Amino acid sequence: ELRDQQEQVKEDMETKCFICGIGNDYFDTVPHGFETHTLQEHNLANYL
Amino acid sequence: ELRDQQEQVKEDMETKCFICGIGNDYFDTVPHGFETHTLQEHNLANYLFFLMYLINKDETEHTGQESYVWKMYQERCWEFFPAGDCFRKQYEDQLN
Amino acid sequence: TMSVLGHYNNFFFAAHLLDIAMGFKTLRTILSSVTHNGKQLVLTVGLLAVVVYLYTVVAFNFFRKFYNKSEDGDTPDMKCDDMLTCYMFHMYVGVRAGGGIGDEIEDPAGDEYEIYRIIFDITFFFFVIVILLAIIQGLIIDAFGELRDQQEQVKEDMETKCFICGIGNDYFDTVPHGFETHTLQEHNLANYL
Amino acid sequence: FWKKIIAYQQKLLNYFARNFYNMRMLALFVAFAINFILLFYKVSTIAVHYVLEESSGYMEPTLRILAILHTVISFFCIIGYYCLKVPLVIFKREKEVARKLEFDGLYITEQPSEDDIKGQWDRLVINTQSFPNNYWDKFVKRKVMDKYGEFYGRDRISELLGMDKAALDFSDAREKKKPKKDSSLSAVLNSIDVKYQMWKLGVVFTDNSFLYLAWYMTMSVLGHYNNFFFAAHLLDIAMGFKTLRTILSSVTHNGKQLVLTVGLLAVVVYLYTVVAFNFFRKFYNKSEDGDTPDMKCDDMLTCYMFHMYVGVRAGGGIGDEIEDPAGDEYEIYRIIFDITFFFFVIVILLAIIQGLIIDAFG
Amino acid sequence: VLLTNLSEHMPNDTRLQTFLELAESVLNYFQPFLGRIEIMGSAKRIERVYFEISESSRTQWEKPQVKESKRQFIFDVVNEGGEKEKMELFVNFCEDTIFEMQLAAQISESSILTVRSALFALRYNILTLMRMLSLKSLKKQMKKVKKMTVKDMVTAFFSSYWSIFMTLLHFVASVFRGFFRIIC
Ligand SMILES: Nc1ncnc2c1ncn2[C@@H]1O[C@H](COP(=O)(O)OP(=O)(O)OP(=O)(O)O)[C@@H](O)[C@H]1O
Ligand SMILES: Nc1ncnc2c1ncn2[C@@H]1O[C@H](COP(=O)(O)OP(=O)(O)OP(=O)(O)O)[C@@H](O)[C@H]1O
Ligand SMILES: Nc1ncnc2c1ncn2[C@@H]1O[C@H](COP(=O)(O)OP(=O)(O)OP(=O)(O)O)[C@@H](O)[C@H]1O
Ligand SMILES: [Ca+2]
Ligand SMILES: [Zn+2]
Ligand SMILES: [Zn+2]
Ligand SMILES: [Zn+2]
């Protein structure tokens, strides 16, 4: 259970953005747009 | 964990193309288009062979595309690698 | 009837302790872990019994001297003279013993059939003890895993799609909070009831 | 006359094919009853006898009748299999060889690997004139003729496939036309094609299920001589019940891995035997009598297989069997050796086997 | 290469497929040699690139150890590969593979007995059963049992498969004998 929970956390973070909740594919239509969005557009540290 | 990792590798390769990253369903809209894309359009061995041929080729004999890819490979810029797009996606209108 | 009988003999009140399983839901889950594969467990026991019967056949045919069990040398106490006695000796002590039937029966040192008895004991230990008990244990473990995966599947299905219409959560979530808005006002199970 | 005999024989074949499975059940039932009766044997006391001592007294003739019945039912099982499943196997082989001949050209363009036993045997079916007898596309000889005639030689390919152009054209023209009465034995003797029947018998003999039935058969026959061979028929419940097949598939799914794990365990035990034979030899005295110097680990073979047997079977390990190291120069070394033996051979490798089974079921 | 380029950019033109049909043999010969990829072009459009592939490169690509290394690389990139560094790890793998490929090429330049025994056992154990029909004892059997009896007919029907089973037993024994002779 512990290991599967860690896998679920990893999968959730790499599949959808934490804040808005849009899937990674839509952002990745633009090259590298997903991590671009998660690091500049919607950043947890930036909100803090 | 070992077995699940093998399953994940298999699932990832059969669900999305390794290079561009587009899902298999979009290519499979055309019959057999997914493995057609992965074996002719975007082939790992083909990219490796292209790198070999570009390295072995002389500088001044390079064509425009070859020289441009050579400059990016020298500067370690991997933007020439397709990402999120392909020939079929670019020419959906004309091809279909 | 068990309470009434417990009046006659007080010890029948102990059978009422089998009620905690349905008294507590979590004990019901623990028992569901093992009872989920009851048919498979019973058939595994039948297979183990058949294998032990085959080993009894082999022992009764060839390895019979080694089954002397009398601590006294004078008394000729033989476990495997009778086929029924040999079989159930294998059923009881060979199965219970951690090493196998060899730890109970005489060692094969200095004998014509030394190597054959040795392979027989090693195979008995490898199949009856190491494998079949592992089969039972894996049955229990993977049944509990099935239960947990089923709970995860239920949770994932309910949080990914609406129960009534069957549309995905993303389309509703295009409007902010529209998914649980739809599932709590638009399409509500309690509301339909 | 001949029509009546062939019709009655065909009725017999159809009945056996219909009732193949029922008597397969009945054979297992009789195998259970015979072994239940066998469970009551008693030894009596150079010459030693096994007698059947029972309160009923009558299940000895009953046991003999059950043995005879088991054999008769078993033979009828071979009859049923040979009339039911054999045509399907022949049809599958015939379609496989026809497509390999027509598309891949496994006997024209390339050649068999000389390791493929089935291809080496199927070299003959091409020369057989009744090529796909069971396979309904009777048409593949001429398809292959059209496909590969131009290059590989018309006559050579025709002789490889067994057909003859001159007779084909002469039959297209007028030919020798005379039918024959069915009552003639010469008609049947000429009609039988020994080549195709030899190929079919070879295929059937190579088939695995018919070999299993033959093994079951020889075991019943041997059980007549010695009644205890009827117990080996209890290995049939695995294929009798699909759920037992699932339980056995749980463990047989990883048979290669299980065997290699046993080999690894044997190698580790061999290394521990090497270490013990080099240093820790005194501790392996096994004589309960102090006077007798019984040594388990004097001989390297005896030391190894002592480790194979008792160290592996024992829950704690080899230390529970060999002498304690108290008050010795090599106390700590022997102790680490025993702890490592227990941790690796017992705790880990057996756990590896158990996890193999569990995760295969998963 | 020119014809293939024209074919892939002029998909519908029938005259072009007529030329392709005329020149299939050259294209069939050069199918392994021609290689194609897609790159992100300088004009912000996907471009297809054609180049020459050496058959030596193809062979040292298809050698098994290179395939195992490629599978291990795929496993590693799928499991712990980042999206930024995936393309870079791929380039490093390509460079190492090319070097090892060239080195391999440079260093490179300049059961049957048992099968035969089993087949022969099949032949001389099936001809033994064929020999009843060859020696035509069934004809004299027919002469002496001209009076059709269902008893005798059922017995012969059983005897056929009984003889088949005996021939199988002899075959298995012969195979075991031949295998023992081979091993010893
Ligand atoms: N809204 C979000 N804000 C931040 N990260 C997000 C968001 N949505 C998704 N992510 C993902 O969550 C991860 C956060 O960064 P990451 O976990 O890599 O940080 P780190 O502390 O540098 O490294 P580590 O991966 O070891 O935790 C990234 O993979 C990022 O793509
Ligand atoms: N860009 C890509 N390049 C190559 N293969 C890709 C790509 N994207 C996805 N794939 C998939 O990865 C797999 C690569 O080929 P594959 O693994 O079958 O090669 P192989 O060595 O012939 O066989 P094996 O499956 O035993 O490894 C294919 O299933 C292919 O569809
Ligand atoms: N048609 C539907 N009707 C009701 N709930 C739905 C429907 N479709 C999906 N759901 C989801 O199923 C769940 C039902 O509510 P929920 O399970 O939270 O109720 P509860 O009894 O208050 O709490 P608990 O989560 O502990 O069971 C919610 O997560 C809801 O979004
Ligand atoms: Ca130039
Ligand atoms: Zn976001
Ligand atoms: Zn692609
Ligand atoms: Zn709804």
Side-chain angles (χ1 to χ4, degrees):
Chain A
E1 298 171 359
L2 293 168
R3 173 205 64 239
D4 288 340
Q5 284 151 33
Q6 315 278 12
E7 289 156 18
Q8 184 74 325
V9 169
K10 297 291 100 175
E11 189 268 335
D12 182 23
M13 290 284 209
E14 317 300 354
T15 45
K16 63 184 295 299
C17 173
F18 168 67
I19 298 296
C20 59
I22 314 175
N24 76 301
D25 59 72
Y26 153 73
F27 300 117
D28 271 312
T29 55
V30 175
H32 301 252
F34 178 61
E35 87 289 5
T36 313
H37 171 86
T38 54
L39 291 179
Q40 289 79 1
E41 299 198 60
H42 287 166
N43 201 31
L44 193 153
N46 282 356
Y47 280 98
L48 191 153
Chain B
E1 298 171 359
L2 293 168
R3 173 205 64 239
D4 288 340
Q5 284 151 33
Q6 315 278 12
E7 289 156 18
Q8 184 74 325
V9 169
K10 297 291 99 175
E11 189 268 335
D12 182 23
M13 290 284 209
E14 317 300 354
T15 45
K16 63 184 295 299
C17 173
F18 168 67
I19 298 296
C20 59
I22 314 175
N24 76 301
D25 59 72
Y26 153 73
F27 300 117
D28 271 312
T29 55
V30 175
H32 301 252
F34 178 61
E35 87 289 5
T36 313
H37 171 86
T38 54
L39 291 179
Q40 289 79 1
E41 299 198 60
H42 287 166
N43 201 31
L44 193 153
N46 282 356
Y47 280 98
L48 191 153
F49 293 140
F50 183 64
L51 200 61
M52 185 180 288
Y53 159 78
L54 192 62
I55 289 158
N56 303 327
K57 197 159 201 186
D58 191 75
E59 272 289 3
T60 187
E61 295 319 320
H62 278 153
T63 77
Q65 280 177 346
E66 294 178 31
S67 66
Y68 152 76
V69 177
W70 184 242
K71 292 183 184 293
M72 297 189 157
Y73 163 70
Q74 294 300 288
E75 68 181 2
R76 300 304 273 197
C77 184
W78 314 127
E79 295 320 290
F80 70 95
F81 276 122
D85 193 77
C86 56
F87 211 87
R88 186 181 293 86
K89 187 159 283 215
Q90 181 97 335
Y91 297 109
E92 263 307 292
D93 300 337
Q94 304 68 27
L95 283 175
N96 296 116
Chain C
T1 302
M2 296 303 288
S3 308
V4 179
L5 279 167
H7 295 285
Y8 303 134
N9 171 234
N10 270 10
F11 294 80
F12 290 104
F13 275 120
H16 302 116
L17 295 179
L18 295 168
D19 206 22
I20 73 189
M22 304 75 70
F24 313 130
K25 275 74 68 177
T26 176
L27 294 174
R28 184 180 294 115
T29 300
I30 309 159
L31 289 179
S32 286
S33 81
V34 64
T35 62
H36 189 43
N37 288 358
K39 183 73 173 152
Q40 298 294 6
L41 278 158
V42 161
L43 298 150
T44 302
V45 167
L47 173 67
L48 178 150
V50 167
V51 165
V52 172
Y53 179 67
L54 299 155
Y55 280 124
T56 300
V57 173
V58 165
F60 186 64
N61 290 40
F62 312 111
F63 315 121
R64 179 142 35 77
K65 30 186 166 336
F66 306 112
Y67 282 63
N68 190 259
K69 186 61 69 178
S70 68
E71 191 274 331
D72 185 35
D74 185 75
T75 46
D77 189 76
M78 295 299 333
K79 301 313 281 168
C80 183
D81 282 337
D82 169 56
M83 174 63 159
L84 174 61
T85 305
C86 195
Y87 179 50
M88 216 295 264
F89 185 83
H90 285 109
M91 234 8 290
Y92 195 44
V93 298
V95 173
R96 279 175 321 151
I101 197 64
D103 287 332
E104 297 295 329
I105 57 173
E106 184 177 1
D107 70 323
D111 190 52
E112 202 189 293
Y113 288 64
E114 180 156 2
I115 190 67
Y116 313 114
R117 181 186 176 281
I118 287 167
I119 305 161
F120 152 77
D121 301 315
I122 292 297
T123 49
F124 187 92
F125 160 70
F126 189 72
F127 286 80
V128 184
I129 301 299
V130 176
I131 280 166
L132 298 173
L133 298 194
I135 281 160
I136 297 165
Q137 292 191 342
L139 281 156
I140 297 168
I141 300 165
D142 275 28
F144 182 76
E146 298 171 359
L147 293 168
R148 173 205 64 239
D149 288 340
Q150 284 151 33
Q151 315 278 12
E152 289 156 18
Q153 184 74 325
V154 169
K155 297 291 99 175
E156 189 268 335
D157 182 23
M158 290 284 209
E159 317 300 354
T160 45
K161 63 184 296 299
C162 173
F163 168 67
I164 298 296
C165 59
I167 314 175
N169 76 301
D170 59 72
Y171 153 73
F172 300 116
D173 271 312
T174 55
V175 175
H177 301 253
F179 178 61
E180 86 289 5
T181 313
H182 171 86
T183 54
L184 291 179
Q185 289 79 1
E186 299 198 60
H187 287 166
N188 201 31
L189 193 153
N191 282 356
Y192 280 98
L193 190 153
Chain D
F1 165 65
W2 274 86
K3 59 209 164 302
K4 296 188 288 291
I5 73 173
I6 300 299
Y8 189 59
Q9 281 189 4
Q10 201 40 67
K11 166 265 197 179
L12 281 180
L13 273 299
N14 285 359
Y15 166 64
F16 277 116
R18 264 179 266 126
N19 286 268
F20 171 62
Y21 300 107
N22 316 325
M23 323 179 55
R24 270 309 305 266
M25 238 43 48
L26 184 66
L28 188 44
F29 179 76
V30 176
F32 278 150
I34 289 176
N35 280 134
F36 183 69
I37 295 171
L38 281 188
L39 183 144
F40 270 73
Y41 276 180
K42 186 40 176 150
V43 69
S44 56
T45 289
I46 5 165
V48 56
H49 280 167
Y50 309 133
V51 301
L52 184 60
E53 182 65 26
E54 310 176 347
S55 72
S56 66
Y58 81 91
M59 309 177 300
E60 191 258 341
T62 305
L63 189 52
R64 297 291 183 184
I65 306 158
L66 274 177
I68 296 161
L69 198 54
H70 193 256
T71 288
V72 167
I73 297 172
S74 310
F75 197 57
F76 291 1
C77 298
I78 296 195
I79 309 169
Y81 184 90
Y82 186 76
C83 61
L84 189 59
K85 297 292 184 181
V86 172
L88 191 55
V89 173
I90 302 300
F91 156 77
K92 295 189 292 293
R93 190 75 86 87
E94 266 173 324
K95 66 187 286 185
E96 275 147 30
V97 68
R99 274 166 219 155
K100 290 181 181 179
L101 198 69
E102 191 277 331
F103 295 103
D104 291 330
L106 189 144
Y107 293 92
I108 294 94
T109 60
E110 68 270 15
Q111 281 313 299
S113 86
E114 288 94 9
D115 285 330
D116 60 354
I117 190 167
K118 66 177 61 78
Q120 293 309 102
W121 189 252
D122 288 333
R123 178 161 304 124
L124 298 175
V125 67
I126 313 167
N127 287 319
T128 72
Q129 65 84 35
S130 189
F131 186 73
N133 167 49
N134 294 56
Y135 180 73
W136 56 85
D137 189 44
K138 305 293 187 291
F139 197 171
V140 55
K141 290 182 182 292
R142 185 176 295 112
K143 280 157 77 193
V144 175
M145 183 63 180
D146 307 325
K147 182 159 183 338
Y148 305 100
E150 56 90 20
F151 175 73
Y152 291 94
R154 301 300 299 270
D155 46 337
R156 200 268 293 166
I157 208 75
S158 77
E159 293 295 327
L160 169 62
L161 295 151
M163 62 191 161
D164 56 357
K165 323 171 194 166
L168 190 50
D169 312 328
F170 177 77
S171 67
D172 290 356
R174 295 292 181 91
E175 79 299 347
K176 181 69 176 178
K177 56 212 188 313
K178 200 162 194 186
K180 200 197 274 178
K181 52 153 63 193
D182 194 27
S183 69
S184 179
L185 193 45
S186 176
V188 179
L189 295 176
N190 300 336
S191 81
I192 298 163
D193 183 26
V194 297
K195 185 62 170 278
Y196 183 60
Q197 311 304 316
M198 163 185 66
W199 173 81
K200 182 173 72 68
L201 263 186
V203 170
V204 171
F205 280 20
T206 56
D207 177 77
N208 308 319
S209 18
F210 178 64
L211 282 164
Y212 187 77
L213 297 200
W215 162 87
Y216 191 77
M217 191 45 163
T218 302
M219 296 303 288
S220 308
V221 179
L222 279 167
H224 295 285
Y225 303 134
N226 171 234
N227 270 10
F228 294 81
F229 290 104
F230 275 120
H233 302 116
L234 295 179
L235 295 168
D236 206 22
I237 73 189
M239 304 75 70
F241 313 130
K242 275 74 68 177
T243 176
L244 294 174
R245 184 180 294 115
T246 300
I247 309 159
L248 289 179
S249 286
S250 81
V251 64
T252 61
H253 189 43
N254 288 358
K256 183 73 173 152
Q257 298 294 6
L258 278 158
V259 161
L260 298 150
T261 301
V262 167
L264 173 67
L265 178 150
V267 167
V268 165
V269 172
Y270 179 67
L271 299 155
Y272 280 124
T273 300
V274 173
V275 165
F277 186 63
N278 290 40
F279 312 111
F280 315 121
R281 179 142 35 77
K282 30 186 166 336
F283 306 112
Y284 282 63
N285 190 259
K286 186 61 69 178
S287 68
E288 191 274 331
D289 185 35
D291 185 75
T292 46
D294 189 76
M295 295 298 333
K296 301 313 281 168
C297 183
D298 282 338
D299 169 56
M300 174 63 159
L301 174 61
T302 305
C303 195
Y304 179 50
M305 216 295 264
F306 185 83
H307 285 109
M308 234 8 290
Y309 195 44
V310 298
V312 173
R313 279 175 321 151
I318 197 64
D320 287 332
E321 297 295 329
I322 57 173
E323 184 177 1
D324 70 323
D328 190 52
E329 202 189 293
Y330 288 65
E331 180 156 2
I332 190 67
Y333 313 114
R334 181 186 176 281
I335 287 167
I336 305 161
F337 152 77
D338 301 315
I339 292 297
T340 49
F341 187 92
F342 160 70
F343 189 72
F344 286 80
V345 184
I346 301 299
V347 176
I348 280 166
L349 298 173
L350 298 194
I352 281 160
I353 297 165
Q354 292 191 342
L356 281 156
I357 297 168
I358 300 165
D359 275 28
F361 182 76
Chain E
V1 161
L2 164 59
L3 268 297
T4 313
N5 215 343
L6 290 173
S7 76
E8 292 183 354
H9 290 112
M10 291 307 61
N12 62 6
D13 205 73
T14 54
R15 298 171 287 120
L16 192 67
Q17 286 94 23
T18 61
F19 271 89
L20 294 157
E21 297 147 20
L22 199 170
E24 290 294 328
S25 64
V26 169
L27 276 155
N28 295 330
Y29 195 86
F30 286 121
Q31 190 272 332
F33 292 94
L34 190 151
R36 59 170 54 70
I37 61 170
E38 277 148 20
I39 59 172
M40 187 66 204
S42 67
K44 292 141 286 297
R45 61 181 292 274
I46 297 298
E47 306 183 315
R48 259 165 189 167
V49 185
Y50 312 94
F51 54 94
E52 159 71 29
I53 301 191
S54 295
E55 294 311 333
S56 66
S57 305
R58 183 67 61 84
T59 58
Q60 281 94 26
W61 168 251
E62 272 165 5
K63 291 183 182 292
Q65 60 254 42
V66 178
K67 210 169 252 173
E68 195 42 74
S69 55
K70 177 254 283 181
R71 277 177 288 223
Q72 194 46 63
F73 177 74
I74 279 164
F75 179 86
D76 299 324
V77 180
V78 167
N79 290 318
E80 63 291 340
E83 68 275 16
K84 271 294 179 178
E85 60 186 2
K86 167 172 158 172
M87 271 305 88
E88 178 72 28
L89 281 160
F90 176 57
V91 163
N92 291 320
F93 176 74
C94 284
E95 280 164 308
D96 306 331
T97 316
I98 291 168
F99 186 81
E100 171 285 329
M101 256 189 192
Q102 290 150 340
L103 166 66
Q106 189 268 330
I107 67 169
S108 293
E109 63 358 17
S110 298
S111 89
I112 309 178
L113 321 173
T114 53
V115 165
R116 194 59 219 170
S117 67
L119 267 48
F120 182 74
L122 287 163
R123 314 193 167 178
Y124 80 87
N125 286 119
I126 297 150
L127 275 295
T128 46
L129 193 148
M130 302 297 120
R131 262 176 282 250
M132 32 172 189
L133 316 163
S134 290
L135 290 171
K136 77 154 161 185
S137 298
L138 271 175
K139 297 183 65 106
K140 278 71 172 155
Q141 181 61 256
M142 184 58 148
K143 315 308 195 279
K144 56 189 184 175
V145 74
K146 283 302 174 58
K147 204 166 302 190
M148 70 292 293
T149 313
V150 74
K151 298 296 289 183
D152 286 32
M153 177 178 132
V154 175
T155 57
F157 175 75
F158 290 161
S159 309
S160 75
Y161 309 114
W162 178 256
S163 59
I164 294 155
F165 173 73
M166 289 347 167
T167 44
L168 184 146
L169 293 181
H170 312 330
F171 168 68
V172 182
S174 308
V175 169
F176 280 136
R177 285 174 254 132
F179 185 77
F180 188 176
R181 286 152 197 152
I182 295 164
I183 60 170
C184 281

